[PDB]
Amino acid sequence: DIVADHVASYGVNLYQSYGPSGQYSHEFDGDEEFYVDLERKETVWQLPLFRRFRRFDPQFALTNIAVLKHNLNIVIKRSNSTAATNEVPEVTVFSKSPVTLGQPNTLICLVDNIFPPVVNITWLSNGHSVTEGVSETSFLSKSDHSFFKISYLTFLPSADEIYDCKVEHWGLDEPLLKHWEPEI
């Protein structure tokens, strides 16, 4: 319910027991600027624009995240181990641009209302999984404290090939298939 011209999270910090896994990123106007790799200890920028005059100390992330571990465990005890409630995810697939049979494009699969931040978004060409030409965003924050993740698949539209966003997440009984075709 807050009005502003631009909203940034100079600190999306996320730590959770399952794993344990965490994430650190900075978002600006609803877009991911970078994420910090928590093993390779490195800032991973999402636009080469930022890799021009700007860096960020990946150590700061690891310090932040190590604290979250500290503070999490404390609140687990304090809460009498109230576990997260597995919500149910909203899934779409659309193209990045108008589709012309024969001319290259990208499928965007948008898995929304994700909680907890644990999910297996995979792609499917004619029902055999594709792993090459894929790439996803990190977890993107939203103001009711769920998340969204977006996976991408570069493809050549042809009246021959048909695609499915297989999304695995505990909120669901079985893995969701959103399915997509070109029009012939």
Partner: protein, 193 residues
């Protein structure tokens, strides 16, 4: 003057998962003329503690967050810091912001194609602020115009689709009119029946 800054959390003393989040929001209006820093500690989905700079101290929000706050508010040096993170962390990154993100423009690319329905497709643009208009013979149509919500691609680019209803006939010329900051002058695309 070189790197971005962030906000710093604090030490407070079907598989199951426990999640903790910390979001350091900044909130901008009129450039750097109105800036609000919030600081949200979150257990699963429950926001439990918060430092909102329009307030000047920590506050719990669920019972759970109370010890966390009580403690921090006592610690004089933390406030000291957290009070000035709206100048240390928010205004800073907006300056580095003004010089990158907030200068990057991307010209949308307009395409008209059949359903009788008719879809003007505005693909790949940034910033978010766009205005699309249909026209039936140099004459604004609004009653037929039905849009999708704005589509965030999350590769720093947006799209929108903007449909128009038209019972067709010969002669009739339909035109999609798109204005957007990337542009010196508006784009128009016509479709001939």
């Amino acid at each position: 003057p070189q790197p971005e800054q962030p906000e710093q959390p604090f030490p407070q003393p079907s598989p199951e998962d426990f999640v903790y989040q910390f979001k350091g929001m900044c909130y901008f209006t009129n450039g750097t003329e109105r800036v609000r820093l919030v600081s949200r500690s979150i257990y699963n989905r429950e926001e439990i503690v918060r430092f909102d700079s329009d307030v000047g101290e920590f506050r719990a929000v669920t019972l759970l967050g109370l010890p966390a706050a009580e403690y921090w508010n006592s610690q004089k040096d933390i406030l000291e810091r957290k009070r000035a993170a709206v100048d240390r962390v928010c205004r800073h990154n907006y300056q580095l912001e003004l010089r990158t993100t907030l200068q990057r423009r991307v010209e949308p690319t307009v395409t008209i194609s059949p359903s009788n329905l008719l879809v003007c497709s505005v693909t790949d643009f940034y910033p978010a602020q766009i205005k699309v208009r249909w026209f039936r013979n140099d004459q604004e149509e609004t009653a037929g115009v039905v849009s999708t919500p704005l589509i965030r691609n999350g590769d720093w680019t947006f799209q929108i689709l903007v449909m128009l209803e038209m019972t067709p006939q010969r002669g009739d010329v339909y035109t999609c009119h798109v204005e957007h900051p990337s542009l010196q002058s508006p784009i128009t695309v016509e479709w001939r029946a």
